[PDB]
Design a protein around this ligand. Structure first.
Ligand SMILES: [Mg+2]
Ligand SMILES: [Mg+2]
Ligand SMILES: [Mg+2]
Ligand SMILES: [Mg+2]
Ligand SMILES: [Mg+2]
Ligand SMILES: [Mg+2]
Ligand SMILES: [Mg+2]
Ligand SMILES: [Mg+2]
Ligand SMILES: [Mg+2]
Ligand SMILES: [Mg+2]
Ligand SMILES: [Mg+2]
Ligand SMILES: [Mg+2]
Ligand SMILES: [Mg+2]
Ligand SMILES: [Mg+2]
Ligand SMILES: [Mg+2]
Ligand SMILES: [Mg+2]
Ligand SMILES: [Mg+2]
Ligand SMILES: [Mg+2]
Ligand SMILES: [Mg+2]
Ligand SMILES: [Mg+2]
Ligand SMILES: [Mg+2]
Ligand SMILES: [Mg+2]
Ligand SMILES: [Mg+2]
Ligand SMILES: [Mg+2]
Lengths: 53, 147, 128, 124, 49, 53, 53, 187
RNA sequence: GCCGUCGCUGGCAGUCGGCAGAGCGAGAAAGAGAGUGGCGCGGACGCUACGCCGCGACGAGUAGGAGGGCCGCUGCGGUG
RNA sequence: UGGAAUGCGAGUGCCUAGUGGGCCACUUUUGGUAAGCAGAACUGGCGCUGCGGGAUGAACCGAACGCCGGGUUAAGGCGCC
RNA sequence: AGGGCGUGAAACCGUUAAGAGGUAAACGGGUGGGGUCCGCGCAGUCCGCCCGGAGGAUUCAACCCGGCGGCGCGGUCCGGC
């Protein structure tokens, strides 16, 4: 959408501090599981080691 | 992915997709482009016409950079300069004409295909075409040469 | 005290015997699992008279009563207690079948739960 | 959105369970426990749950408030109804109808809050 | 009569739909003033326009 | 989507192929509800053919 | 010399990253991967900088 | 038995898109609803085009959308496309256009918005005009692909201006026998 | 009668409920439209829309093709 | 008044496996004394195809096949098998 | 698990049990006979409502207090984002 909320930073004691950060626009990009999968099942072929008889 | 391929549905059928009468022998036509003139002539004439013979002059030590000349058409000539150069000449009133240097963008010859917008230009280029130069005069503009 | 199903229709099956493989009787290397015979001169795949039969799609079961045990219930493998609450709103049409590996200490506290939930178990006296 | 993240959760969830030609779902607030857009207890903006009370007796009802939507901690409200078998099935009914709160789930909520009462009586 | 009544099926929407009511004939052949199984029999017997 | 990426060379978040992904709110909206034919939600199972003779 | 490694377009690895971040701020798409976040106070869980200390 | 032939019983049209993306499989849900629940043969064409492969819905150029929306009569209409609206750098003036496409390249959003036109989506269009009143369906050139130059009558055939498959093109790559009236013949 | 394939490019987002009014099978292109003057708090199921439902027609097959396998084998990333 | 009848949704585009030993029959038909021979034409078959009949049977007569209940037939039959 | 000793399949063989036996055996369709175990069969389903029949509660409605949540065209309330 277009409405970017105001997330609140949480102190290390769990309780919410005063600091706020506007939700970055990345958290509204399209969710594409097919693109995510196609990219994952190709990028993790790269860390593979050769093997052969 | 073998699990998607066609040899996984071909388990259990004797000839494995290749024929009972005519087997899948090794090379029943010769290897490669064999028989281009004898038994594969209908194919080398129906699909690769002109494949056999010589034509033209040889050129022994050809160097592909003496004949370097990339062209740009007039339609996308105005895309070499920024946008506030084509519109600044619109808002302009003193008749000034922007200098489009083409060999600076990476083209040597200017061919004239597209239409042009009505404003003057000064096209610096290495080689010009007759029509590319006439379409520039007919709009008002100069065809500078640069060696 | 049997746990009756929702409705118990009449189950009709177009065939009861298994579909044995061609020539699974003369040999021991040929198991009973079915393999469509693809030989040229074969007498089974030409559908001769009096030969073995072939699994057509015509033998399919009525969809209304397909996979349905003779107790009018469908079935579900249950690996632990938590997989019963999944089945507690399908009570009167599906049953539970504790897996083969669930030891008797857990299978007792699984039949115990399914008794409260009124879920029917097919093997409730299994291991003990 | 609901239909968006349902088109992501419809097959590659972790609560999805697929065996014996059936397909149930183990979501927290899924009542009827079956994998469907309508009864999924995590996708929508307003869901309903009917769990058993932590002690022996009672039925807890879990509504999902509107205001807190990305705050999982302060998102759900819970109310334990430890009453007779009929008042609790007129309280869930009012909770849903009179509030006009996800009203297509009411008979599902009663049918579940009855399975709990039935699974909390003394066995025979 | 025996044919149209007992074995009479209509090619409606390219579907062999059994002629069970006059509103299956009127709905298709109505524009020719054939609106009942009797107008149908009369059109077949007396070869009509 | 209006301010490019600063740390990358030229990158803007991928655009959206549809904005209001809530086709429930889309479908029960007065814009679309008015432009529909009445639902034909009656089931007409096969009529047994008796013999008019 | 089997082809072990695959290469992906950069704009597509970035599409996949933005799709794997836009999906980590949704309570359903995180509680469906299996994580036990029934008591996290807010999903884009931010903490003060002293945590790096 | 009946003596029919089942050669053509299975019509091969696309019952659904082959892609698995969920921002398309939601458009196809909304338009499958509009397609069946309205009597407008517009939605039926949009739905039938949302199935089509990436080679059957080709790109549009901004210039071809200019000259197809400049035709007399169709003013103040929304230009609907099912493919993408690419830029056309060889056009200098851009009017204001109401447009609705699946994609608009990041240099055609610029031009259209700086002109002053709107760029809707297919859900925005479905809310603006459900039955699709006031629209102009378009589609880019389908025979534009270089693939369609090798199709037709095979080369080496009287009056078959079909492009052959050659490794490289040059003096000595298929220019000798079936092309010269001198060396052999030509067609 | 049942299974399946094909076709209808069929139907279903209308579960529109005390902010209610429960319909779109009927031969005849189009509104159960607006305005302008003469007690008892109640109502089954559904909708994994890749889902569900209704209608007809059809069902041989070597070589070959295609699809669907919640058929099976071994390991990998996730998840139970 | 869409200018005969009857029937039926058509048009178009790529990619493409297998095949390129055939055989039989009515009718026409060439060589041969003829052949379960050699060779053509048209259609239908066998090959790729079960089923009822012809005792038996690649090709003849009927008839073409999802799995089943009732009824009726085809071609063939009805002393007994 | 007894010194080539984890598990210890198949073909093949021995013995015990059960049946059977002159058209080699085996096989598909159909039943019948006997066995083996299973149903933990052998007095046979429960569920909602209502009517009556006998009992038991610290109990219903309606009011009062406190909390919580939904909705609000609060026509157009305050302050936010
Ligand atoms: Mg085959
Ligand atoms: Mg072979
Ligand atoms: Mg092949
Ligand atoms: Mg070959
Ligand atoms: Mg080969
Ligand atoms: Mg030669
Ligand atoms: Mg043989
Ligand atoms: Mg054969
Ligand atoms: Mg048939
Ligand atoms: Mg066929
Ligand atoms: Mg075909
Ligand atoms: Mg078949
Ligand atoms: Mg050969
Ligand atoms: Mg001959
Ligand atoms: Mg053969
Ligand atoms: Mg044939
Ligand atoms: Mg035959
Ligand atoms: Mg004889
Ligand atoms: Mg019969
Ligand atoms: Mg006889
Ligand atoms: Mg041992
Ligand atoms: Mg050990
Ligand atoms: Mg041992
Ligand atoms: Mg003995």
């Amino acid at each position: 959408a277009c409405a970017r909320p105001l997330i609140s930073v949480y102190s290390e004691k769990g309780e919410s501090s005063g600091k706020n950060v506007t939700l970055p626009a990345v958290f509204k990009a399209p969710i594409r599981p097919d693109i995510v999968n196609f990219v994952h099942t190709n990028l993790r072929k790269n860390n593979r080691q050769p093997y052969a008889v | 992915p073998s699990r998607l391929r066609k040899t996984r549905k071909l388990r259990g059928h004797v000839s494995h997709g290749h024929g009972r009468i005519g087997k899948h022998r090794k090379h029943p036509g010769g290897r490669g482009n064999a028989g281009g003139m004898h038994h594969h002539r209908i194919n080398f004439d129906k699909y690769h016409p002109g494949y056999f013979g010589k034509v033209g002059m040889r050129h022994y030590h050809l160097k592909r950079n003496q004949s370097f000349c990339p062209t740009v058409n007039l339609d996308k000539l105005w895309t070499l300069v920024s946008e506030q150069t084509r519109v600044n000449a619109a808002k302009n009133k003193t008749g000034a004409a922007p200098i489009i240097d083409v060999v600076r963008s990476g083209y040597y010859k200017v061919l004239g295909k597209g239409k042009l917008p009505k404003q003057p230009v000064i096209v610096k280029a290495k080689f010009f075409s007759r029509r590319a130069e006439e379409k520039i005069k007919g709009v008002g503009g100069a065809c500078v040469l640069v060696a | 005290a049997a746990l009756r199903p929702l409705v118990k229709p009449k189950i009709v099956k177009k065939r009861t015997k298994k579909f044995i493989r061609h020539q699974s009787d003369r040999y021991v290397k040929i198991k009973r699992n079915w393999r469509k015979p693809r030989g040229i001169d074969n007498r089974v795949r030409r559908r001769f008279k009096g030969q073995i039969l072939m699994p057509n799609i015509g033998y399919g079961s009525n969809k209304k009563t397909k996979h349905m045990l003779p107790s009018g219930f469908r079935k579900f493998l249950v690996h632990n207690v938590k997989e019963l609450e999944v089945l507690l709103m399908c009570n009167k049409s599906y049953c539970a079948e504790i897996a083969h590996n669930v030891s008797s200490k857990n299978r007792k506290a699984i039949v115990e739960r399914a008794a409260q939930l009124a879920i029917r178990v097919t093997n409730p006296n299994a291991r003990l | 959105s609901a239909h968006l993240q349902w088109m992501v959760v419809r097959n590659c969830s972790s609560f999805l369970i697929k065996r014996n030609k059936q397909t149930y779902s183990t979501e927290p607030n899924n009542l009827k426990a079956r994998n469907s857009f309508r009864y999924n207890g995590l996708i929508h903006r307003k869901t309903v749950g009917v769990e058993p009370a932590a002690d022996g007796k009672g039925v807890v009802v879990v509504m999902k408030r509107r205001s807190g939507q990305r705050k999982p901690a302060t998102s759900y409200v819970r109310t334990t109804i430890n009453k007779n078998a009929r008042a609790t099935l007129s309280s869930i009914r009012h909770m849903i109808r009179k509030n006009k709160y996800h009203p297509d789930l009411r008979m599902a909520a009663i049918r579940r809050a009855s399975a709990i009462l039935r699974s909390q009586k003394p066995v025979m | 009569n025996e044919l149209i009544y007992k074995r009479g099926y209509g090619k409606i929407n390219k579907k062999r739909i059994a002629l069970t009511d006059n509103t299956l004939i009127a709905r298709s052949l109505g524009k020719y003033n054939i609106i009942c199984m009797e107008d149908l029999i009369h059109e077949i017997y007396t070869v009509g326009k | 989507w209006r301010k490019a990426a600063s740390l990358k060379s030229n990158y803007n978040l991928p655009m959206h192929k549809m904005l209001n992904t809530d086709l429930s709110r889309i479908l029960k909206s007065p814009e679309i509800q008015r432009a529909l034919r009445a639902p034909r939600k009656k089931i007409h199972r096969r009529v047994l053919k008796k013999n008019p003779l | 010399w089997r082809r072990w490694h695959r290469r992906v377009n950069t704009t597509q690895k970035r599409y996949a990253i933005c799709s794997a971040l836009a999906a980590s701020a949704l309570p359903a798409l995180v509680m469906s991967k299996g994580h036990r976040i029934e008591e996290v106070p807010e999903l884009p869980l931010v903490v003060e900088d002293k945590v790096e200390g | 038995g009946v003596d029919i032939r089942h050669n053509k019983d299975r019509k091969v049209r696309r019952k659904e898109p082959k892609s698995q993306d969920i921002y398309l499989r939601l458009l196809v849900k909304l338009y499958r609803f509009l397609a069946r629940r309205t009597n407008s043969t517009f939605n039926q064409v949009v739905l039938k085009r949302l199935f089509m492969s990436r080679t059957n819905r080709p790109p549009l150029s901004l210039s071809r959308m200019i000259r197809k929306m400049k035709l007399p009569g169709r003013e103040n209409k929304t230009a609907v496309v099912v493919g993408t609206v690419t830029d056309d750098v060889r056009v200098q003036e851009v009017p204001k256009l109401k447009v609705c496409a699946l994609r608009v390249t990041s240099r055609a959003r610029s031009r259209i918005l700086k002109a002053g036109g709107k760029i809707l989506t297919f859900d925005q269009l479905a809310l603006d005009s459900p039955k699709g009143r006031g629209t102009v369906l378009l589609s880019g050139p389908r025979k534009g692909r270089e693939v369609y130059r090798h199709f037709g009558k095979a080369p080496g055939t009287p009056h078959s201006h079909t492009k052959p498959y050659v490794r490289s093109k040059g003096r000595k790559f298929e220019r000798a026998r079936g092309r010269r009236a001198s060396r052999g013949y030509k067609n």
